[PDB]
Amino acid sequence: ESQPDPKPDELHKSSKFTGLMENMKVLYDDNHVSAINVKSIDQFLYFDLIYSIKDTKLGNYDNVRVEFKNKDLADKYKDKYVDVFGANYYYQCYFSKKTNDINSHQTDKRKTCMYGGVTEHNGNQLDKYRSITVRVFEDGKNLLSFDVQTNKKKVTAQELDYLTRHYLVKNKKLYEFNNSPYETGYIKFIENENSFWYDMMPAPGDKFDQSKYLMMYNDNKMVDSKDVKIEVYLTTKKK
Numbered sequence: 001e002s003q004p005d006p007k008p009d010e011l012h013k014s015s016k017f018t019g020l021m022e023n024m025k026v027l028y029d030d031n032h033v034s035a036i037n038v039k040s041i042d043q044f045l046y047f048d049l050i051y052s053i054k055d056t057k058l059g060n061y062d063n064v065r066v067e068f069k070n071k072d073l074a075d076k077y078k079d080k081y082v083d084v085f086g087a088n089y090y091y092q093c094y095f096s097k098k099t100n101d102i103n104s105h106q107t108d109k110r111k112t113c114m115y116g117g118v119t120e121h122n123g124n125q126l127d128k129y130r131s132i133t134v135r136v137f138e139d140g141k142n143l144l145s146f147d148v149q150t151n152k153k154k155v156t157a158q159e160l161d162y163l164t165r166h167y168l169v170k171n172k173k174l175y176e177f178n179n180s181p182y183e184t185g186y187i188k189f190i191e192n193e194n195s196f197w198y199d200m201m202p203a204p205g206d207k208f209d210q211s212k213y214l215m216m217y218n219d220n221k222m223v224d225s226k227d228v229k230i231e232v233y234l235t236t237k238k239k
């Protein structure tokens with residue numbers, strides 16, 4: 001069980017962020033990118049892939065740019081049929097501008113951007129959703145547990161993360177417009193000796209960089225739905 005647990009002073013303090021929690025909230029509200037059995041259709045930079053995924057409700061986007069940590073990840077998934085799932089942003093998002101020569105590009109009307117959140121479709125399917133347990137702790141006490149479901153054998157940490165936080169925003173007011181009732185918090189995934197966590201709170205300051213925050217998912221970290229367990233540790237802001 002190692003990826004050093006955070007030392008209490010290591011975590012971002014929500015009281016140190018003085019600039020609109022709504023921008024964090026939106027990433028984990030009901031909207032998100034999801035598609036099954038799609039194939040990249042273009043590329044803007046050598047470390048990304050462009051997908052033809054239409055916003056199936058709000059009609060907010062027609063193309064989604066998936067950015068990876070490096071060229072390898074983009075190469076691996078180029079041309080392959082994948083499922084996509086993840087938190088997207090719009091504000092600092094941009095790519096291609098047109099189907100121009102020299103500058104390899106394409107994409108017309110309504111774009112969105114995201115990091116990682118990709119898995120091979122083929123051979124990664126289960127008929128019969130697997131249920132992953134989430135145990136949340138508030139100041140040290142296991143106050144509740146809820147389930148998250150995925151029908152993927154291999155699932156990105158991004159998806160389990162979004163799933164978990166989406167429930168907490170709805171039932172625990174994890175993030176609110178201008179604040180959060182929690183001072184610190186982190187999501188811990190556990191497979192085996194392998195455990196890793198993400199800080200759920202925004203960095204100190206007056207502004208939150210959605211793009212920079214969502215960047216932690218660019219490694220396309222995957223996990224096996226059969227071996228994972230998730231624990232959330234929240235601490236209450238000095239009442």
Ligand SMILES: OC[C@H]1O[C@@H](O[C@H]2[C@H](O)[C@@H](O)[C@H](O)O[C@@H]2CO)[C@H](O)[C@@H](O)[C@H]1O
Pocket residue numbers: 127
């Ligand atoms: O069993 C062969 C049969 O599968 C259908 O697909 C179904 C599948 O039967 C069911 O278990 C699953 O839950 O939903 C699928 C619907 O896509 C196919 O429609 C049929 O063409 C055969 O392929």
